[PDB]
Short mmCIF file of C-alpha atoms (C1' of nucleotides) in Angstrom, two decimals:
data_model
loop_
_atom_site.label_atom_id
_atom_site.label_comp_id
_atom_site.label_asym_id
_atom_site.label_seq_id
_atom_site.Cartn_x
_atom_site.Cartn_y
_atom_site.Cartn_z
CA UNK F 1 133.62 64.13 11.90
CA UNK F 2 132.28 66.80 14.26
CA UNK F 3 134.28 70.00 14.74
CA UNK F 4 133.72 73.28 16.56
CA UNK F 5 134.93 75.95 14.12
CA UNK F 6 135.41 79.67 14.84
CA UNK F 7 137.17 82.67 13.28
CA UNK F 8 139.35 84.53 15.79
CA UNK F 9 141.42 87.50 14.59
CA UNK F 10 143.50 86.62 11.52
CA UNK F 11 143.29 82.89 12.32
CA UNK F 12 140.73 80.05 12.31
CA UNK F 13 140.38 77.62 15.24
CA UNK F 14 139.17 74.02 14.91
CA UNK F 15 138.49 71.96 18.04
CA UNK F 16 137.61 68.26 18.07
CA UNK F 17 140.61 67.22 15.98
CA UNK F 18 141.31 63.48 15.92
CA UNK F 19 143.77 61.14 14.18
CA UNK F 20 145.91 64.08 13.04
CA UNK F 21 149.61 64.90 13.41
CA UNK F 22 151.41 67.62 11.45
CA UNK F 23 154.91 66.09 11.43
CA UNK F 24 153.60 62.65 10.38
CA UNK F 25 151.37 64.09 7.63
CA UNK F 26 153.91 66.48 6.07
CA UNK F 27 156.71 63.88 6.20
CA UNK F 28 154.76 60.87 4.87
CA UNK F 29 156.23 61.55 1.42
CA UNK F 30 153.06 63.01 -0.12
CA UNK F 31 153.85 66.75 -0.01
CA UNK F 32 156.93 68.98 -0.30
CA UNK F 33 156.03 72.62 0.45
CA UNK F 34 155.39 72.39 4.20
CA UNK F 35 158.19 73.33 6.59
CA UNK F 36 158.42 73.21 10.39
CA UNK F 37 158.60 76.46 12.36
CA UNK F 38 160.57 76.81 15.61
CA UNK F 39 157.44 76.34 17.77
CA UNK F 40 156.67 73.04 16.01
CA UNK F 41 154.00 74.60 13.79
CA UNK F 42 154.13 74.25 10.00
CA UNK F 43 154.11 76.93 7.28
CA UNK F 44 153.14 76.00 3.72
CA UNK F 45 152.11 77.38 0.34
CA UNK F 46 149.10 75.72 -1.32
CA UNK F 47 146.24 76.93 -3.56
CA UNK F 48 147.84 80.39 -4.03
CA UNK F 49 147.80 80.95 -0.24
CA UNK F 50 150.36 80.92 2.58
CA UNK F 51 149.19 79.68 5.99
CA UNK F 52 150.62 78.47 9.28
CA UNK F 53 149.05 75.40 10.87
CA UNK F 54 149.56 74.57 14.55
CA UNK F 55 148.14 71.61 16.47
CA UNK F 56 147.81 71.73 20.27
CA UNK F 57 146.17 68.50 21.45
CA UNK F 58 142.78 68.38 19.73
CA UNK F 59 142.94 72.07 18.77
CA UNK F 60 144.08 73.21 15.32
CA UNK F 61 145.23 76.80 14.76
CA UNK F 62 145.41 78.00 11.14
CA UNK F 63 146.95 81.47 10.91
CA UNK F 64 146.62 83.97 8.01
CA UNK F 65 143.24 82.68 6.81
CA UNK F 66 139.50 83.36 7.01
CA UNK F 67 136.30 81.32 7.47
CA UNK F 68 135.66 81.48 3.70
CA UNK F 69 139.07 79.99 2.81
CA UNK F 70 138.87 77.36 5.57
CA UNK F 71 135.76 75.68 4.16
CA UNK F 72 136.55 76.37 0.50
CA UNK F 73 140.20 75.24 0.64
CA UNK F 74 141.61 73.96 3.94
CA UNK F 75 138.81 71.68 5.20
CA UNK F 76 139.16 69.47 2.12
CA UNK F 77 142.93 70.04 1.95
CA UNK F 78 143.59 68.34 5.30
CA UNK F 79 140.72 65.91 4.59
CA UNK F 80 138.95 66.73 7.87
CA UNK F 81 135.57 65.26 6.86
CA UNK F 82 136.86 61.67 6.85
CA UNK F 83 137.05 59.36 9.88
CA UNK F 84 140.59 57.94 10.08
CA UNK F 85 139.74 56.09 13.30
CA UNK F 86 137.54 53.62 11.42
CA UNK F 87 140.21 53.26 8.70
CA UNK F 88 142.88 52.52 11.33
CA UNK F 89 140.61 49.95 13.02
CA UNK F 90 139.77 48.23 9.71
CA UNK F 91 143.40 48.00 8.54
CA UNK F 92 144.60 46.83 11.99
CA UNK F 93 142.95 43.46 11.25
CA UNK F 94 146.23 42.84 9.43
CA UNK F 95 148.95 42.50 12.12
CA UNK F 96 151.58 44.20 9.93
CA UNK F 97 149.57 47.42 9.55
CA UNK F 98 148.64 47.48 13.25
CA UNK F 99 152.36 47.71 14.08
CA UNK F 100 152.79 50.29 11.29
CA UNK F 101 149.84 52.40 12.49
CA UNK F 102 151.13 52.93 16.06
CA UNK F 103 154.01 55.01 14.65
CA UNK F 104 151.79 57.12 12.37
CA UNK F 105 148.45 57.52 14.14
CA UNK F 106 148.00 61.04 12.74
CA UNK F 107 148.66 60.55 9.02
CA UNK F 108 145.94 62.03 6.82
CA UNK F 109 146.02 62.04 3.01
CA UNK F 110 146.03 65.65 1.81
CA UNK F 111 143.80 66.66 -1.09
CA UNK F 112 146.32 68.81 -2.98
CA UNK F 113 145.95 70.77 -6.24
CA UNK F 114 146.01 68.66 -9.42
CA UNK F 115 148.53 70.83 -11.28
CA UNK F 116 151.03 71.19 -8.40
CA UNK F 117 150.83 67.47 -7.55
CA UNK F 118 151.44 66.59 -11.21
CA UNK F 119 154.54 68.79 -11.57
CA UNK F 120 155.78 67.95 -8.06
CA UNK F 121 155.83 64.23 -8.81
CA UNK F 122 157.18 64.79 -12.33
CA UNK F 123 160.15 66.27 -10.43
CA UNK F 124 160.15 63.27 -8.05
CA UNK F 125 161.29 60.66 -10.62
CA UNK F 126 164.76 59.23 -9.87
CA UNK F 127 165.15 61.88 -7.16
CA UNK F 128 165.71 62.08 -3.38
CA UNK F 129 163.28 64.11 -1.24
CA UNK F 130 165.66 66.97 -0.25
CA UNK F 131 166.32 67.72 -3.95
CA UNK F 132 162.61 67.50 -4.90
CA UNK F 133 161.80 70.06 -2.18
CA UNK F 134 164.58 72.33 -3.49
CA UNK F 135 163.53 72.19 -7.16
CA UNK F 136 159.86 72.88 -6.30
CA UNK F 137 160.83 75.96 -4.25
CA UNK F 138 163.04 77.07 -7.17
CA UNK F 139 160.07 76.84 -9.56
CA UNK F 140 158.05 78.83 -7.01
CA UNK F 141 160.69 81.56 -6.54
CA UNK F 142 161.50 81.78 -10.26
CA UNK F 143 158.02 81.66 -11.83
CA UNK F 144 155.55 82.06 -8.95
CA UNK F 145 153.66 85.06 -7.60
CA UNK F 146 154.83 86.83 -4.41
CA UNK F 147 152.69 86.73 -1.25
CA UNK F 148 153.72 87.93 2.22
CA UNK F 149 153.12 86.59 5.73
CA UNK F 150 154.79 87.90 8.91
CA UNK F 151 157.30 90.04 6.96
CA UNK F 152 158.70 87.19 4.84
CA UNK F 153 157.97 86.80 1.11
CA UNK F 154 156.54 83.46 -0.04
CA UNK F 155 155.87 82.29 -3.60
CA UNK F 156 152.90 80.49 -5.17
CA UNK F 157 153.36 77.40 -7.34
CA UNK F 158 153.52 78.48 -11.02
CA UNK F 159 150.44 77.76 -13.15
CA UNK F 160 150.72 76.33 -16.71
CA UNK F 161 150.09 79.80 -18.21
CA UNK F 162 153.02 81.13 -16.15
CA UNK F 163 155.38 78.46 -17.53
CA UNK F 164 154.65 78.21 -21.28
CA UNK F 165 156.44 81.44 -22.27
CA UNK F 166 159.81 80.03 -21.15
CA UNK F 167 162.19 77.72 -23.00
CA UNK F 168 163.40 74.36 -21.63
CA UNK F 169 166.79 75.81 -20.60
CA UNK F 170 165.07 78.53 -18.53
CA UNK F 171 163.06 75.84 -16.72
CA UNK F 172 166.26 73.78 -16.32
CA UNK F 173 167.65 76.66 -14.22
CA UNK F 174 165.56 75.27 -11.32
CA UNK F 175 168.12 72.43 -11.03
CA UNK F 176 165.55 69.86 -12.22
CA UNK F 177 167.90 68.42 -14.87
CA UNK F 178 166.50 66.19 -17.63
CA UNK F 179 163.06 66.68 -16.06
CA UNK F 180 162.85 70.19 -17.57
CA UNK F 181 161.41 68.93 -20.88
CA UNK F 182 158.72 66.98 -18.99
CA UNK F 183 157.62 70.12 -17.13
CA UNK F 184 157.67 72.01 -20.46
CA UNK F 185 155.50 69.32 -22.10
CA UNK F 186 153.17 69.17 -19.09
CA UNK F 187 152.66 72.95 -19.08
CA UNK F 188 152.06 73.02 -22.84
CA UNK F 189 149.42 70.26 -22.74
CA UNK F 190 147.36 71.74 -19.88
CA UNK F 191 147.62 75.32 -21.18
CA UNK F 192 146.34 74.34 -24.64
CA UNK F 193 143.29 72.69 -23.03
CA UNK F 194 144.51 69.38 -24.48
CA UNK F 195 144.40 68.00 -20.93
CA UNK F 196 141.60 69.27 -18.69
CA UNK F 197 142.45 69.05 -14.99
CA UNK F 198 139.15 70.47 -13.69
CA UNK F 199 137.12 67.77 -15.47
CA UNK F 200 139.64 64.96 -14.81
CA UNK F 201 137.71 63.58 -11.81
CA UNK F 202 134.79 62.68 -14.12
CA UNK F 203 136.74 59.81 -15.72
CA UNK F 204 137.48 56.35 -14.33
CA UNK F 205 140.82 55.65 -12.61
CA UNK F 206 142.17 53.70 -15.62
CA UNK F 207 141.12 56.51 -17.98
CA UNK F 208 142.91 59.14 -15.87
CA UNK F 209 146.11 57.04 -15.83
CA UNK F 210 146.05 56.98 -19.64
CA UNK F 211 145.30 60.72 -19.94
CA UNK F 212 148.21 61.79 -17.72
CA UNK F 213 150.73 59.32 -19.19
CA UNK F 214 150.34 61.08 -22.57
CA UNK F 215 152.57 63.82 -21.13
CA UNK F 216 156.22 62.99 -21.77
CA UNK F 217 157.85 62.02 -18.47
CA UNK F 218 154.68 60.80 -16.77
CA UNK F 219 154.45 57.04 -16.26
CA UNK F 220 152.41 54.80 -13.93
CA UNK F 221 153.87 56.10 -10.64
CA UNK F 222 153.44 59.84 -11.28
CA UNK F 223 149.90 59.20 -12.57
CA UNK F 224 149.11 57.10 -9.47
CA UNK F 225 150.32 59.85 -7.12
CA UNK F 226 148.15 62.44 -8.89
CA UNK F 227 145.23 59.99 -8.65
CA UNK F 228 145.72 59.33 -4.92
CA UNK F 229 147.00 62.66 -3.56
CA UNK F 230 144.94 64.96 -5.81
CA UNK F 231 141.89 63.04 -7.09
CA UNK F 232 141.32 61.05 -3.88
CA UNK F 233 140.86 57.57 -5.34
CA UNK F 234 141.92 55.49 -2.33
CA UNK F 235 141.65 52.05 -3.97
CA UNK F 236 145.06 52.79 -5.52
CA UNK F 237 148.51 51.78 -4.26
CA UNK F 238 151.27 53.96 -5.78
CA UNK F 239 154.33 51.70 -5.70
CA UNK F 240 157.76 53.25 -5.30
CA UNK F 241 161.00 51.33 -4.65
CA UNK F 242 160.58 51.92 -0.89
CA UNK F 243 157.06 50.50 -0.54
CA UNK F 244 158.09 47.66 -2.88
CA UNK F 245 160.88 46.67 -0.47
CA UNK F 246 158.56 47.23 2.52
CA UNK F 247 155.83 44.98 1.05
CA UNK F 248 158.52 42.49 -0.08
CA UNK F 249 160.25 42.22 3.31
CA UNK F 250 157.09 42.19 5.46
CA UNK F 251 154.59 40.14 3.41
CA UNK F 252 155.63 37.97 0.44
CA UNK F 253 159.17 37.39 1.79
CA UNK F 254 160.42 37.19 -1.82
CA UNK F 255 161.22 39.68 -4.60
CA UNK F 256 158.69 41.22 -7.00
CA UNK F 257 157.90 43.50 -9.92
CA UNK F 258 156.10 46.83 -9.25
CA UNK F 259 153.02 45.31 -10.95
CA UNK F 260 152.52 42.24 -8.72
CA UNK F 261 153.35 44.18 -5.53
CA UNK F 262 150.62 46.67 -6.50
CA UNK F 263 148.02 43.99 -7.28
CA UNK F 264 148.75 42.24 -3.97
CA UNK F 265 147.94 45.35 -1.91
CA UNK F 266 144.82 46.50 -3.81
CA UNK F 267 143.51 42.93 -3.40
CA UNK F 268 144.34 42.82 0.33
CA UNK F 269 143.35 46.37 1.36
CA UNK F 270 140.64 47.32 -1.16
CA UNK F 271 139.25 50.86 -0.84
CA UNK F 272 141.80 51.61 1.90
CA UNK F 273 144.99 50.88 -0.08
CA UNK F 274 146.04 54.54 -0.23
CA UNK F 275 145.85 54.89 3.55
CA UNK F 276 147.73 51.61 4.02
CA UNK F 277 150.39 52.92 1.61
CA UNK F 278 150.87 55.95 3.88
CA UNK F 279 151.20 53.97 7.12
CA UNK F 280 153.74 51.56 5.62
CA UNK F 281 155.77 54.41 4.09
CA UNK F 282 156.19 56.37 7.34
CA UNK F 283 156.72 53.10 9.23
CA UNK F 284 159.36 52.21 6.62
CA UNK F 285 161.25 55.45 7.29
CA UNK F 286 160.89 54.97 11.07
CA UNK F 287 162.50 51.50 10.97
CA UNK F 288 165.31 52.53 8.60
CA UNK F 289 165.75 50.36 5.50
"C1'" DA W 1 193.04 63.81 1.78
"C1'" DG W 2 190.86 64.50 -2.71
"C1'" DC W 3 189.34 62.24 -6.76
"C1'" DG W 4 186.35 58.61 -8.07
"C1'" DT W 5 182.50 55.59 -8.67
"C1'" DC W 6 177.89 54.65 -7.56
"C1'" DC W 7 173.06 55.93 -7.34
"C1'" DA W 8 168.53 58.55 -5.94
"C1'" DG W 9 160.93 56.75 -12.31
"C1'" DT W 10 160.51 57.10 -17.31
"C1'" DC W 11 162.10 57.14 -22.22
"C1'" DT W 12 164.37 55.22 -25.92
"C1'" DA W 13 166.42 51.64 -28.52
"C1'" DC W 14 166.24 47.25 -29.39
"C1'" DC W 15 164.72 42.68 -28.66
"C1'" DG I 1 154.87 41.88 -26.92
"C1'" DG I 2 159.36 42.88 -22.90
"C1'" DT I 3 163.23 45.71 -20.78
"C1'" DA I 4 168.66 47.45 -20.03
"C1'" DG I 5 170.76 51.42 -20.07
"C1'" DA I 6 170.84 56.40 -20.30
"C1'" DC I 7 169.43 60.56 -17.69
"C1'" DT I 8 170.57 65.91 -14.51
"C1'" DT I 9 172.11 67.15 -10.02
"C1'" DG I 10 174.38 66.12 -6.32
"C1'" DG I 11 175.21 63.69 -1.93
"C1'" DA I 12 177.38 59.25 0.08
"C1'" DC I 13 181.23 56.36 0.46
"C1'" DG I 14 185.91 53.85 -1.33
"C1'" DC I 15 190.62 54.18 -0.57
#
DNA sequence: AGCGTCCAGTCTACC
DNA sequence: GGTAGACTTGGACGC
């Protein structure tokens, strides 16, 4: 992907943007901390930074950042290096995905922080999106570090070291419920060095699954989401109830277990299963099931 | 009405 | 070996 990048004032401008849409990306069910501003731009808190992203045609405007942070953080965050046009063309050979793609032509898989993704999807279990978004912002406000942008105070996502000194009940004050003990166990295990997140990409996909599932409250799904949305292993297909029913209704025309639904997609899509999972998800929400 | 009953991945208990 | 039922918080839907 070829872009013309320039620093201009307190913002960074990227021209030559393709296969990208803010609304579609931030509402594909992968992230939770990005919110729409009145002009249609999005403000979010990731990697201990607060930025506003705005897309005007093929021009991206990232406010409150510098050329150092753009290449070090945001280039890889929005996965700008990858060609989604080739991915869309390849997947479109299946007629079901072609129909799914036309509704989400701008979905890109974000490369989010390992720790935030882990805790975010620990919170996601048996939980609707609006509540997940609320609990995460509670954790941020309660235990995060304050940063300001345009007069308003925003909060970073709490690190493991910033969570270990609190009891379960204190964590439970974020309205997370029974999930509090899982967050407490997750924070304890990373803080002790018992689970290394920086070196986690060195292991195979199956090894990573096993490493993360050692944390109480992390099963296959949470582990899969961390693997896809944070590690960037795209040959995975994280199966939630929604995608199960989407793959059921549109392909097999029967009913299935999360295991066989998963093995059907990885077989059919291969190294592009993660992208396919995104197009079907947003298409699933667009059709209303 | 307002009060109820159901439900949005993982663990635990028990096969 | 496998899974049914419990699980916080809270919003939807019944009558």
